[PDB]
Design an enzyme around this catalytic site. Structure first.
Site, PDB file in Angstrom:
ATOM      1  N   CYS A 272      -3.912   6.480  -4.861  1.00 42.17           N
ATOM      2  CA  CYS A 272      -3.511   5.073  -4.737  1.00 42.17           C
ATOM      3  C   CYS A 272      -2.081   4.884  -5.236  1.00 42.17           C
ATOM      4  O   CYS A 272      -1.836   5.000  -6.438  1.00 42.17           O
ATOM      5  CB  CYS A 272      -4.456   4.112  -5.489  1.00 42.17           C
ATOM      6  SG  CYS A 272      -4.147   2.363  -5.101  1.00 42.17           S
TER       7      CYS A 272
ATOM      8  N   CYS B  71       0.860  -1.189   0.000  1.00 45.21           N
ATOM      9  CA  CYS B  71       0.000   0.000   0.000  1.00 45.21           C
ATOM     10  C   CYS B  71       0.877   1.212   0.000  1.00 45.21           C
ATOM     11  O   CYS B  71       1.695   1.421   0.902  1.00 45.21           O
ATOM     12  CB  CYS B  71      -0.900  -0.008   1.212  1.00 45.21           C
ATOM     13  SG  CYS B  71      -1.903   1.459   1.313  1.00 45.21           S
TER      14      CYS B  71
END
Ligand SMILES: O=C([O-])c1ccc[nH]1
Ligand SMILES: O=C([O-])c1ccc[nH]1
Lengths: 353, 357
Positions: free
Chosen positions: A259, A89
């Protein structure tokens, strides 16, 4: 303090990053991927209590910190969300690098301008840098991560979804997670808050169907063999940005940030198609207007190893090194409490089916 | 520059109650309704920062603590949510009573099994009681609140909602907030998790239409002059409960608890209709299967003060006093931070506004 966990609650440009710094017992595993699998297989109620209402919510995200295992790493990290555990992530990596410096986990050398923070993650080593605020000791202006190798995997995959979506064509790319990348135009909806519930729905449909119909396998990491994220993209709103996107993942939650892994997968895809050069800045915008900056810093072909996209005319598969930059804020220091008689000690969601 | 607030993060049967205990700026006001107004009018960014993402979310709820002003109160309290500021809140009162005893805000007398905690709220004085666990000084088993007076206000109000809802008939009742009370059946939606978006939408459209069409006014509290909550009720799933409900309020958020003011409102309504008697236990279930217990403690007529339901021949309006009992848990001790350079220091929502065409 009975069942308690200490958290540095952060966000990266609107996306939560609840960093659990204490409260875990020993978690068996000889690397971070095994420790992730242990949590998932044996202690999944923890993720649920930390991520979901009432302590969290349907779009919460976070991570557990550990001692580093791999040589060179400062910190081990396992990521979690409302549905599971991503292998990497970007936004939470950016947050962890920031918190490591701001809270003193990692020392700042006298007169440093940049401070390295290396994360040992289930996808591999992620080399971070906290860029210090000009006149300060440990105040972080923003942070960069050099992601694990990213690559386009498979192009023009036709996925058959039900009405109103029907057939949709996507690329599969790896940016720390496997992504299906799809233009919003193909779904018949534009990226907006008005459409967010449909984008969520469309992203769940797409993920489910491609994992049924297309088996993916990271050629260097056996444990990575599903598509966990759907990146829906379209034209930018901010003129500084190349494109806008929303990523659907977890229990069809949406990333409020651009993201980081999805930006890496996008850049790898664009780079494979000849549309980005080394060092060129790519700017990705989120549903909220947030920006991340990416650069491809390196490419490599790996002879005798291929993925579905790799042509016979090429020696081996193309991989790229992506750097992502953004900004995280500490938004709280929380001691989270779990009373054994609390009926929602393991959390709940009201999200439909 | 940098601001921090300390919170006791609680929940009452699944419904958040973020209690801000320090770090607020100093606020004027000669009563809690004025402090609420001052926040609403001049410092609404505090509520937004504390309630909304990223520090909160679209179903978050809480309260600020103040010194009490009204004689007899232990704590002044102002409630907040994702849209604005409710004049009373049952689940958060239950949480505050609980937290007051558990964290030593109020002391426990010698060998007490029950500890009073009185709250000074924008709706009036709310007398609470923490009920203690057996062999403990400060462990709370549950808490009860005696609400401000409740009443049926207006009965069988028909309003026309957009398709697919059409015309609906409701009661308007005050339980610390004004509620429109409607059967789920009239909306053609079952109360279920699967239907929560639709329930939110119908609740919003009904709240809006009701306020457009019916102008309400609390006869003793000038500042309460809107319907802030919609209570959608139906058959219980738990056979211990009389009914099940979901209350839609705020920026069309939904209460996960059975709703303490909405229980009071429902009990005042049933009472007015002869369907509930003093001292009788009424059990209300939430969408999550949470239960609250309520009892009418007493009734009273206020001579020469009428609301629409009050008959020409009746000399004054009927009000009841309800007690509500539930359980709250401490879920976090939080120090919440706000960097001046954070573009989300004041929160965000991705929920879209809706309105009738
Ligand atoms: O930043 C990212 O890589 C990410 C993945 C899921 C949510 N954010
Ligand atoms: O318990 C209550 O009164 C309440 C009002 C709004 C949410 N809960």
């Amino acid at each position: 303090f009975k069942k308690s966990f200490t958290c540095i609650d952060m966000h990266t440009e609107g996306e939560a990053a609840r960093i659990v710094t204490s409260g875990l017992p020993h978690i068996p595993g000889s690397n971070m991927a095994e420790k992730k699998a242990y949590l998932q297989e044996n202690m999944d109620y923890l993720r649920r209590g930390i991520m979901l209402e009432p302590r969290g919510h349907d779009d919460m995200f976070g991570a557990f910190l550990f001692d580093p295992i791999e040589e060179g790493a400062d910190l081990g990290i396992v990521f979690m969300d409302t549905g599971g555990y991503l292998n990497m992530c970007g936004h939470n990596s950016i947050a962890a690098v920031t918190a490591a410096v701001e809270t003193g986990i990692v020392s700042v050398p006298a007169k440093a301008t940049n401070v390295p923070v290396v994360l040992d993650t289930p996808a591999g080593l992620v080399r971070g840098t906290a860029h210090l605020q000009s006149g300060t000791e440990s105040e972080v202006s923003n942070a960069s991560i050099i992601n694990v190798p990213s690559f386009l995997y498979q192009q023009d995959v036709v996925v058959v979804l039900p009405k109103p979506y029907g057939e949709v064509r996507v690329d599969i790319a790896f940016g720390g997670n496997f992504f299906a990348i799809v233009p919003a135009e193909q779904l018949g909806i534009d990226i907006s808050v008005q459409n967010l519930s449909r984008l969520q729905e469309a992203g769940e449909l797409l993920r489910t169907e491609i994992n049924r119909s297309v088996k993916v396998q990271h050629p260097q990491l056996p444990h990575i063999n599903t598509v966990d994220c759907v990146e829906i993209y379209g034209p930018p709103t901010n003129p500084e940005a190349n494109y806008k996107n929303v990523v659907i993942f977890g229990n069809r939650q949406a990333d409020r940030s651009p993201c980081g892994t999805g930006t890496s997968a996008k850049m790898a895809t664009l780079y494979a198609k000849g549309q980005l050069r080394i060092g060129e800045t790519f700017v990705y915008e989120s549903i909220l207007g947030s920006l991340f900056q990416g650069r491809v810093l390196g490419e490599e072909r790996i002879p005798g190893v291929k993925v579905p996209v790799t042509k016979d005319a090429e020696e081996g598969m193309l991989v790229v090194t992506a750097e992502i930059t953004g900004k995280a804020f500490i938004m709280g220091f929380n001691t989270m409490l779990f009373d054994p008689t609390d009926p929602f000690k393991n959390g709940f969601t009201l999200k439909q089916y």
